[PDB]
Design a binder for this molecule. Structure first.
Ligand SMILES: O=C(O)CNC(=O)C(=O)O
Ligand SMILES: [Mg+2]
Ligand code: NI
Ligand SMILES: [Zn+2]
Length: 331
């Protein structure tokens, strides 16, 4: 078995190898990359996502989210308070202000220590989940707005034809902005490109051990667990690496820098934080290997997780028993 310790793998495709996205994903899995839940892909040196970022300040963040924490430093939840709209130029100036900017630090490890010590005492503002793309239309390789759709994958593998569309999302971050522990909707893959700015640190649990993280989360967030049988779908819970190590949860960490892709694999729990002002683009995708994960994915029916139009069809076709109750939650 390849990659039996479930380490995060780093790939350096040539420009030739970067032509065929599907083929490269299958390659990475042939080497065991999926076992980690997360892989890094460094694009060939000849590739670029777009010519310059010189003109992005006019993008609107219609609903910036203030991420307010509750709990203790290593075990907390966050709620998202909606803020007034602002442009990316306005958000970047806020990120760089004395109140919100990255503190002085020695290296990524010192910064990680400071994040886990101090996160809960601040409320950074995250411009998350903005439909759009920063890839140039002329970028033909690994252009996250030109991928094969999940609906088309389901049609090719299973014959069934369904409604829905699959488009990318932009994320504008600042110091301490946080993504809570989650898997993707319907345990899909994700791919995330860091277009510019400061790094993003990721933590990940191997898919084969995801249920260990779930059991810990039920112990650490016991009221949330009684409220919903899949409350990590709410995307609000944080657990630090220290706490994971104290409880024997297998995990890995890696820091993504500007210009790099990350892929999350089906049922790979992940969480993390931004080091400073940045912009990422991400989208969900599927392969044939995902189908079985999609059939088995948990679902929030308490009603809180409230997800996309396109997820309806996935549930309806892959999980027809759950359909009914999942849609009672979503209506
Ligand atoms: O970048 C972020 O805030 C969160 N991204 C993801 O969870 C992802 O790409 O799957
Ligand atoms: Mg602009
Ligand atoms: Ni994700
Ligand atoms: Zn729920």
């Amino acid at each position: 078995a390849q990659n039996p310790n479930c380490n995060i793998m780093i790939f350096h495709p040539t420009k030739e190898e970067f032509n065929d996205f599907d083929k490269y994903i299958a390659y990475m899995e042939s080497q065991g990359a999926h076992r980690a839940g997360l892989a890094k892909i460094i694009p060939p040196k000849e590739w670029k996502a777009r010519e310059t970022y010189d003109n992005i300040s006019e993008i609107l963040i219609a609903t910036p989210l203030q991420q307010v924490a509750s709990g203790r430093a290593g075990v907390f939840t966050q709620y998202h308070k909606k803020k007034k709209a602002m442009t990316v130029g306005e958000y970047r100036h806020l990120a760089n202000s004395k109140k919100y900017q990255t503190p002085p630090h020695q290296n990524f490890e010192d910064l990680e220590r400071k994040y886990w010590k101090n996160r809960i005492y601040n409320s950074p503002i995250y411009g998350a989940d903005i439909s759009g793309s920063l890839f140039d239309e002329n970028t033909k390789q690994w252009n996250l707005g030109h991928l094969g759709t999940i609906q088309d994958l389901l049609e090719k593998e299973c014959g069934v034809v369904i409604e829905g569309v699959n488009t990318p999302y932009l994320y504008f971050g600042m110091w301490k902005t946080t993504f809570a522990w989650h898997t993707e909707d319907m345990d899909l893959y994700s791919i995330n490109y860091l277009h510019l700015g400061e790094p993003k640190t990721w933590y990940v649990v191997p898919p084969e051990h995801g249920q260990r993280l779930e059991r810990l989360a039920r112990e650490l967030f016991p009221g949330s667990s009684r409220g919903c049988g899949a409350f990590l779908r709410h995307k609000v819970a944080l657990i630090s690496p220290t706490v994971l190590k104290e409880n024997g949860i297998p995990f890995n960490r890696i820091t993504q820098e500007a210009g790099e892709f990350m892929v999350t694999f089906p049922y790979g729990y992940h969480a993390g934080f931004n080091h400073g002002f940045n912009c990422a683009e991400a989208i969900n995708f599927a392969t044939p290997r995902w189908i079985d994960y999609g059939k088995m994915a948990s679902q929030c029916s308490c009603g809180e997780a409230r997800v996309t139009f396109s997820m309806d069809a996935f549930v309806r076709i892959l999980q027809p028993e759950r359909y009914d109750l999942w849609k009672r939650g979503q209506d």
